[PDB]
Amino acid sequence: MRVLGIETSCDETGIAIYDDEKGLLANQLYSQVKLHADYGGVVPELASRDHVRKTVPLIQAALKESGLTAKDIDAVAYTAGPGLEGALLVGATVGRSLAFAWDVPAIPVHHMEGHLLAPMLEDNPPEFPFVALLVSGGHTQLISVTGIGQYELLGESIDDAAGEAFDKTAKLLGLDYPGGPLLSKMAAQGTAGRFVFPRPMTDRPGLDFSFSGLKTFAANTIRDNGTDDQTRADIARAFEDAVVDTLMIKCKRALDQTGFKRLVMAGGVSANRTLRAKLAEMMKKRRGEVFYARPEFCTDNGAMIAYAGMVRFKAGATADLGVSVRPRWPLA
Amino acid sequence: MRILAIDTATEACSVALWNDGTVNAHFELCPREHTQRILPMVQDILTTSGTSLTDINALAYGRGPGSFTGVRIGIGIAQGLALGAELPMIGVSTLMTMAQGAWRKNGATRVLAAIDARMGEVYWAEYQRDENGIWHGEETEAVLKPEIVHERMQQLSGEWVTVGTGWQAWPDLGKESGLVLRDGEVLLPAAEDMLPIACQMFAEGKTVAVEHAEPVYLRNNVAWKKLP
Ligand SMILES: Nc1ncnc2c1ncn2[C@@H]1O[C@H](COP(=O)(O)OP(=O)(O)OP(=O)(O)O)[C@@H](O)[C@H]1O
Ligand SMILES: [Fe+3]
Ligand SMILES: [Mg+2]
């Protein structure tokens, strides 16, 4: 079967088509980064307006790219939450009325389940069970995954997510929003050890996260040191090394606690090259296995929604004619 | 000619069907339920008139202005339907729709439409029906402070009818205007009143493919300040 997936949760419009025999037949994406860079954040009203401009044309391009026609699609999936209400409503209204017109099932998809399952788009995907590290712009969670739709919360951030912590520290370093990837490119030039930052919530047992104190630690170091290029890099690297060691430690504790040998990492921060190398290394020494998506599937995209819609459909989750979105919508 | 019209731009959800002359129509207030009622209402109108989406010739949608969210629900639903059934689309002004409704209800031919836009402002239009049934005034559509509406009304003359929630929020909007103002008996747009407008637009070839359907927002200054 084939599912058309529609992603308009925040500031990206993604359309994809996934075929469970042949894989991903189309993937289309429009990022609104230019539009929101100016504001230092996403303006809900402007994000909503841009989705209206992109959604339909990206659907048309997707069907063109795949050489498919309406009768070739068996279901329409769309992100129903979490995210910005106004953005979510664009994808969900187009998606739900499109499915009505094609007279096929309409599948509401949880945005974070989308991220969690993105590593299933690569060769030799993970089998259940596994620990999953969802580390994105607004989420940072450890989850015990024992099967489809079977998610258990192991730990979560009590304050900022790791993605936002990268973004905030990046801005202090004077980088453009979102600077996560930029901070990471700067950190590569830095000399290991020049500064040493705390690993938050690692001196007591437990699986929860906190990143707010690490932000201030870096902000204070930036304030009380030279703003030359090499010093800025040394700070970016200490910060990234602090975050990456924290996530590594927490993942270790979660693997220890569940006894699982598989670690799945998802969300935008999982594009981080230091983090990928660190978690791959750890799983090698545990004689286990790490899984993550290609970099472009770690951040928002429609591919993950077409896949996760396919899975949700096979598990029986379809929508009636009413359309509803859920801006806040807990996964586990 | 079959035309299907939908509207969710304000607190009302409505759908209406034009079959070569006969009109079938539903209307209801849907505060906080638009996305829940809209597609059920479309389904019902199609089944009760025994028509299928593939037999529609064009899809008319309320293009704005109004609630930003409501306007996007309307165009999103319309786009999904039109993409899916390969229908051309016709965008109908919310202010003009209410003018058509005053014409239908009491034969008004001069309509001052005002929609409460929030933020102390209204969506404003001056519509006048000509002898051939064509509404003039599209170029007057704007979002305006009440004092500016006041000044504009002092440049108008004669007798007009009032429609829209803007008169309900600002019942003295027309105070000291110099005009004779009568209540038009239309608070909200109705899809039924889009059909005749949509019919004329279809005759004129004035339809578009789904990818060119556009919302009209009017208020465009909608962002917090840019960074330095
Ligand atoms: N290479 C990188 N290193 C560090 N952080 C990164 C990197 N690449 C992306 N990110 C961060 O990932 C985040 C965005 O990822 P994602 O797209 O999954 O977030 P999102 O769409 O906002 O999802 P959510 O709704 O949970 O926030 C940003 O904060 C971004 O800077
Ligand atoms: Fe995301
Ligand atoms: Mg995003």
Numbering used by the authors:
A (entry chain A): 1 to 332
B (entry chain D): 1 to 228
Publication excerpt:
We wanted to test the pertinence of the ADP bound at the YgjD–YeaZ interface using two mutants, YeaZR118A and YgjDV85E. The crystal structure of YgjDV85E–YeaZ in the presence of ATP showed no ADP-like electron density at the dimer interface. The mutations of two residues that contact this ADP molecule (YeaZR118A and YgjDV85E) did not confer any effect on the heterodimerization of YgjD and YeaZ, nor on the activation of the ATPase activity of YjeE. The ATPase activity of the ternary YgjDV85E–YeaZ–YjeE and YgjD–YeaZR118A–YjeE complexes remained unaffected and the latter is fully active for the in vitro biosynthesis of t6A.
The N6-threonylcarbamoyladenosine (t6A) modification at position 37 of ANN-decoding tRNAs is one of the few modifications that are found in the three domains of life. In the first half of the reaction, YrdC utilizes ATP, L-threonine and bicarbonate to synthesize an unstable intermediate TCA, whose threonylcarbamoyl-moiety is subsequently transferred onto the adenosine at position 37 of the substrate tRNAs by the cooperative action of three proteins YeaZ, YgjD and YjeE. In archaea and yeast, the transfer reaction requires the kinase, putative endopeptidase and other proteins of small size (KEOPS) protein complex, composed of Kae1, Bud32, Cgi121 and Pcc1, complemented by a fifth fungi-specific protein Gon7 in yeast. It is now well established that YgjD and its orthologs Kae1 and Qri7 are responsible for the catalysis of the transfer reaction. YgjD and YeaZ are forming a heterodimer that is capable of interacting with YjeE.
